[PDB]
């Protein structure tokens, strides 16, 4: 909101629209974790921590009093700075449709990388455990791409034996995705068989994920909480350059660590 301070920027409204559009297309295209996990909607700049509902025993307490401490997970506030030329942004008021906005795309992809790598592989400095590093199940080795169907079925069986039901999604890192969607077994495309074995939507390509992943889609296992949602704010400017940032506040919780199985790349 007013923490973004956008009315102080030397930017015309149509250039603000161009910046927002550029960031928005990247975010809607590339945010993979938000496609897969439960979303606790944006709560604003004041939301500070997620209540886990848990209690921790306090050490050195007397005998006539029982004392316990509430547990929370504080949110991380993330800012990715970027810089734009003021003349390039003035161009759009003269009718230019392609202002130089590559630093917007750079900052947006960096923010996407931060969020998705926290969701899939954790962010220890933010106190975040990811899906892959928190699963207790043994990682399955997928020797070749043609082994993906068997592996998927095997992973589903593992999830079934741990009590994790629900439709199962296959999430592919970039290399696994490209190899799977190029592969044929005696001409028949492997991705067709694999798609028949999982949830019927398009398979999620996750740029931040190493290898592949099979996870439950029943809900309630993985929860991303957003405070301030992805925003563009103004920081500073001089005569020629304006400094902006991408801002988000969020945290990610693994509620059920055994709801995913990691597949080693094929």
């Amino acid at each position: 909101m007013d923490l973004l301070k956008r009315h102080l920027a030397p930017i015309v409204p149509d250039a603000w629209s161009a910046i927002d559009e550029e960031a928005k297309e990247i975010f809607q295209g590339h945010l993979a974790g938000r496609k897969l996990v439960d979303f606790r909607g944006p709560f604003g700049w004041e939301y500070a921590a997620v209540n886990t509902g848990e209690l921790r025993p306090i050490d050195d307490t007397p005998e006539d009093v029982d004392m316990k401490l509430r547990q929370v997970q504080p949110l991380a506030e993330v800012r990715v700075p970027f810089t734009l030329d003021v003349t390039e942004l003035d161009s759009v008021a003269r009718g230019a449709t392609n202002p130089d906005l590559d630093d917007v795309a750079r900052a947006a992809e960096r923010m996407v990388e931060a969020e998705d790598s926290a969701i899939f592989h954790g962010w220890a400095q933010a106190g975040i455990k990811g899906i892959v590093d928190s699963t207790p199940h043994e990682a399955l080795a997928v020797a070749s791409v043609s082994d993906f169907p068997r592996a998927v079925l095997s992973a589903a069986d593992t999830l079934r034996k741990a009590g994790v039901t629900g439709p199962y999604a296959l999430v592919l890192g970039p290399k696994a995705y490209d190899d799977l969607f190029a592969a044929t077994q005696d001409g028949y495309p492997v991705a067709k068989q694999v798609q028949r074995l999982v949830v019927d939507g398009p398979l999620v390509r996750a740029n931040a994920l190493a290898g592949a992943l099979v996870m439950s889609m029943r809900g309630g296992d993985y929860e991303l909480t957003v405070g301030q949602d992805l925003s563009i704010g103004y920081a500073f400017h001089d005569r020629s350059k304006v400094e902006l940032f991408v801002a988000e506040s969020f945290t990610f919780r693994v509620l059920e660590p055994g709801a995913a199985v990691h597949l080693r790349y094929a």
Partner: peptide, 9 residues
């Protein structure tokens, strides 16, 4: 004043 991304699925 966010970009309005929200939940994606």
């Amino acid at each position: 004043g966010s970009l309005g991304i929200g939940s994606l699925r």
